[PDB]
């Protein structure tokens, strides 16, 4: 039933007695459900060290992964170029998923096309799909560039993108000089970040390989910046802001911040902003190229060093205090521009916040996951705050990366109780947060189900989630945040300390029981 002046949605409608009784009758009559006592027994067992040991012996099964597939990353890379349509050669079902995934995280339109290969293409490949797909996309959506990646069907049947694109031009489906950079993006290699690297390197090669004989390193007096796979708008913005404050000439190569944040003013804008073709053609003339997320830009790095002859600096992601300092000092060295008063002051305001909040952060224990560079930067900043990363999970991490993070842990007493995990998923992480319970998790929205699980064991076992990463689908507008630079560090600190104080207030809100410690001032 409903009362018209206080209409109930699913929650709490289905808690009405009539629905409760109906659902009990369904269960008893027809579901042949395991008895509650057995459900409870199995749940308890899934919280044990014995269960964790079995869980960590998995070789074949993956449960609740913390990564996605290459083409997702190619699409994000492509979106950062002016008037560029991402185009995924292969199966359309993929593109429905890539768009929806980004739509949910950014709450924005996400434009991407497929060339709709079907089973018929297994006989003689997707060449005709490419010809008609390129012609149709160009006519209909009027991009100035089409950036082509692949789905796993196209990879398995072995379609040669280069030949197919060349033949599309040869036969007049798309103009000879219309830019169609490409990259092979197999979903069964690496992850979404690998797809970003592949795509970027494809675009860089397209605009520069054949024109290198007129290029001179340093002649344009700029620094190139390659952001990698980045889903916080504040991260593109803060890098641009800091370089502008320093008076450093720069080119941000792949810059989707405008197309992922168009105004609602009565018109839909399929394209906005982005890196220009002129910028990509002129990029080898920069002083140097800085990679913001080097642990997924290894192919890009090889191209930039081997072909552009840039001496790419060995810089960590600019997260936290030390690595933001290192980034600014390196940029200063390359550009000859001093670090200005404004950034020195910003840095000291972060340090002030650290001094103000240190007593509540000290010794706090975190489980955390994400992509390699984000995770390493978060670990570094947590050590700087006097926190203990204890469970560090990077599903798409590698051995070299893990050694690097193990080195960072060794340079700090706050690293002593920490373990780095690669190739492990959120069902592994679930075991760790039961067997070696931390104070909080820092992760994406998939973390909510771990929090749910921990609460079921008991309130004293609950591990609250702090949402930092990708995707975040169950909160609004967190994609506007920042994690890089001093501004990102100030935002992360604020979120952490207030998460700690919010939990403390929950724990001390019980009248005459725990409210002796429900302090007004903290």
């Amino acid at each position: 039933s409903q009362q018209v002046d206080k209409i109930k949605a699913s929650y709490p409608l289905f808690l009405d007695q009539d629905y409760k009784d109906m659902l009990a009758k369904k269960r008893d009559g027809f579901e042949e459900k395991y008895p509650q006592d057995k459900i409870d027994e199995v749940f308890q067992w899934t919280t044990t060290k014995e269960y964790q040991e079995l869980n960590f012996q998995r070789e074949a099964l993956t449960v609740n992964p913390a990564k996605a597939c290459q083409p997702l990353g190619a699409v994000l890379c492509a979106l950062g170029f002016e008037k560029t349509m991402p185009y995924v050669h292969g199966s359309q079902g993929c593109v429905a998923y890539f768009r929806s995934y980004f739509n949910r995280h950014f709450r924005e339109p996400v434009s991407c096309v497929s060339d709709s290969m079907t089973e018929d293409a297994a006989v003689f490949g997707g060449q005709q799909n490419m010809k008609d797909g390129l012609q149709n996309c160009k006519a209909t959506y009027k991009p100035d560039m089409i950036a082509v990646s692949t789905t796993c069907m196209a990879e398995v049947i072995g379609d040669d993108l280069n030949a197919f694109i060349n033949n599309s031009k040869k036969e007049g489906f798309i103009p000879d000089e219309f830019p169609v950079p490409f990259a092979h993006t197999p979903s069964f290699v690496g992850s979404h970040v690998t797809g970003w690297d592949n795509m970027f390197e494809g675009i860089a090669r397209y605009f520069t390989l054949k024109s290198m004989d007129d290029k001179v390193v340093g002649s344009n007096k700029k620094i190139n910046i390659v952001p990698g796979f980045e889903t916080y708008l504040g991260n593109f913005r803060v890098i641009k802001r800091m370089l502008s404050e320093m008076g450093v000439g720069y080119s941000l190569l792949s810059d989707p911040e405008e197309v992922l944040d168009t105004p609602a003013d009565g018109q839909f804008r399929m394209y906005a902003g982005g890196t220009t073709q002129e910028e990509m053609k002129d990029a080898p003339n920069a002083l140097n190229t800085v990679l913001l997320q080097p642990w997924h830009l290894e192919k890009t790095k090889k191209f930039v060093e081997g072909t552009w002859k840039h001496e790419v600096p060995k810089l960590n992601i600019p997260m936290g205090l030390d690595w933001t300092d290192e980034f600014l000092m390196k940029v200063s060295e390359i550009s000859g521009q001093p670090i200005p008063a404004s950034l020195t002051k910003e840095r000291g305001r972060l340090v002030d916040m650290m001094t103000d909040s240190h007593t509540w952060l000290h010794g706090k224990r975190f489980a955390l996951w994400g992509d390699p560079d984000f995770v390493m930067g978060l670990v570094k900043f947590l050590l700087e705050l006097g926190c203990e990363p204890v469970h560090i999970l990077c599903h798409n991490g590698n051995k070299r990366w893990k050694k690097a993070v193990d080195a960072i842990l060794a340079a700090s007493p706050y690293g002593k109780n920490a373990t780095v995990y690669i190739g492990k998923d959120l069902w592994h992480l679930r075991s760790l947060v039961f067997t070696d319970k931390p104070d909080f998790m820092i992760g994406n929205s998939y973390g909510k189900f771990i929090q749910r699980d921990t609460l079921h064991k008991g309130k004293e076992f609950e591990v609250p989630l702090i949402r930092i990463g990708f995707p975040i689908f169950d909160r609004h507008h967190l994609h506007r945040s920042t994690t890089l630079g001093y501004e990102g560090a100030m935002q992360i600190l604020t979120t952490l300390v207030n998460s700690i104080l919010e939990r403390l207030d929950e724990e001390t809100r019980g009248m005459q029981a725990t409210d002796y410690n429900h302090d007004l001032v903290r």
Binding site: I7, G29, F30, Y34, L61, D132, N136, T140, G266, F268
Partner: protein
């Protein structure tokens, strides 16, 4: 807009396309004529999408794993192949259930074989067998496994049927191989068909020689309700208040046992025709169980459906039918009285999958609203046959609409509200057109039944009439 004006709009929009695409798309766009009963005289459907045009469609894996199988709550569904498909489709669809997730129910979890290069090169059948053993170790209360094939599985020549038979016999467990690779078919549609045949072949006949279930003359199954936001529960309540016994729900909040008991029912009640007509026909062929289509969107359709269903039984159920209708009359009349004056005359355009583009029209009409355009991602002509009499004369119909087409139609038609999916939502909001998600219910619902209609009305009103829409133009422009 007149017939001539709409025809003119279609031609103008098609002008952008190259010739091959223009000629194809013309066949998928029509001006409705409710007189016409054979839609194959006015629109083509269930064909391949044109490359490069930004179809909104998904794939057969979405139609099998995401739609039919994934909701079955006490089975583990393996996304078999590389990591992407299972991750993007993990908990995206609000097929609600009651259970203890990770213990006896598994719907919002993503189980995957996470194929790497070695699995593409040398095959994944050994991995799948080992995976099955790991599932059994770590999830002992699962009541069966399905294997949802992604694109690579058939392309590399893996034999998941052999693995399913051998492992299923070794563990005495139902293990269902589903050949729903995204390269098959043209859309979600063929995934439904594949999935229905897999239920038929591997699950539905398990109890054919079992005589232990005590049947009653009033036993029904709800076929093709995926319990979006609880829709199947708000349907079930009414059927049971009318004196029927709902033995099974396919597949929202569904259990494997309920599926296995379905051949014992007296009548199959089909909500989603498109996804579950296949198994409904099978059950009539094999078990002699009749089926009928119904509609629980809005009071007019819900009342018509309750009466039509009750007419299949005896006087005792017809009497309870009228009791149910009398009980809820003041509730839905109060909803109409509050919300119809706020919505009367407003014009809506819909674009959804295979059922809702026609099924929700009555509920709009119950609030005095007019559906001026509608269309489907993956419907067949039997769906369009059912649509043309539900839609007004001279309205616009679109099959597998391109992004470009939908935007241009909206610009001309200037509907007051659009009801479509997540890939459409943010486009139309930027244009200043109120938008409701008509797949996910915008995280609201249920919308089925009487209790759902109250929430539907609330929702259309809160969005169409929201103060935000008066604010898109800066007062200095």
């Amino acid at each position: 807009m007149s017939r001539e004006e709409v025809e003119s709009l279609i031609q103008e929009v098609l002008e952008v396309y190259p010739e091959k695409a223009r000629k194809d798309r013309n066949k998928h766009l029509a001006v409705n004529d409710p007189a016409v009963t054979q839609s194959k005289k006015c629109i083509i459907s269930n064909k391949k999408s044109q490359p490069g045009l930004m179809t909104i469609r998904g794939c057969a894996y979405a139609g099998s794993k995401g739609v039919v199988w994934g909701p079955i709550k006490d089975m583990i569904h393996i996304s078999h192949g590389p990591v992407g498909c299972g991750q993007y489709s993990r908990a995206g669809r609000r097929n609600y259930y009651i259970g203890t997730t990770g213990v006896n129910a598994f719907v919002t979890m993503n189980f995957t074989s996470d194929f790497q290069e070695k699995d593409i090169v040398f095959g994944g059948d050994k991995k799948l067998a080992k995976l099955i053993d790991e599932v059994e170790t770590l999830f002992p209360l699962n009541k069966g496994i399905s294997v949802q094939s992604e694109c690579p599985i058939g392309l590399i020549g893996d034999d998941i049927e052999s693995v399913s038979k051998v492992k299923g016999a070794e563990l005495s467990k139902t293990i269902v191989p589903v050949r729903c690779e995204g390269f098959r078919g043209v859309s979600q549609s063929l995934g439904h068909h594949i999935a229905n045949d897999a239920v038929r072949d591997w699950v539905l006949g398990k109890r054919d020689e079992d005589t232990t279930f005590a049947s009653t003359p009033y036993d029904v199954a709800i076929i093709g309700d995926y319990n979006i936001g609880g829709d199947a529960w708000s349907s079930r309540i009414l059927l049971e208040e009318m004196g029927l016994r709902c033995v099974a729900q396919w597949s929202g909040d569904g259990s494997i046992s309920e599926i296995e008991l379905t051949p014992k029912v007296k009548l199959n009640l089909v909500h989603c025709y498109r996804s579950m007509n296949y198994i409904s026909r099978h059950m009539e062929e094999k078990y002699g169980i009749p089926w009928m289509e119904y509609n629980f969107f809005g009071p007019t359709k819900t009342i018509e459906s309750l009466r039509a269903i009750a007419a299949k039984f005896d006087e005792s159920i017809q009497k309870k039918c009228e009791e149910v209708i009398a009980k809820y009359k003041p509730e839905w009349e109060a909803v109409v009285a509050k919300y119809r004056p706020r919505l009367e005359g407003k014009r809506v355009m819909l674009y959804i999958g295979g059922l809702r583009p026609r099924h929700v029209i009555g509920a709009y009409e119950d609030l005095g609203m007019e559906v001026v355009g509608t269309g489907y991602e993956f419907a067949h002509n039997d769906d369009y046959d059912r649509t043309m009499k539900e839609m007004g004369d001279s309205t616009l119909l679109y099959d597998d609409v391109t992004g470009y087409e939908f935007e241009e139609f909206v610009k001309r038609i200037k509907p007051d509200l659009i009801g479509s999916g997540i890939k459409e939502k943010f486009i139309f909001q930027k244009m200043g057109i109120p938008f409701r998600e008509m797949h996910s219910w915008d995280y609201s619902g249920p919308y089925h039944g009487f209790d759902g209609f109250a929430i539907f009305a609330r929702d259309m009103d809160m969005t169409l009439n929201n103060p935000c829409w008066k604010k898109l133009q800066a007062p200095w422009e």
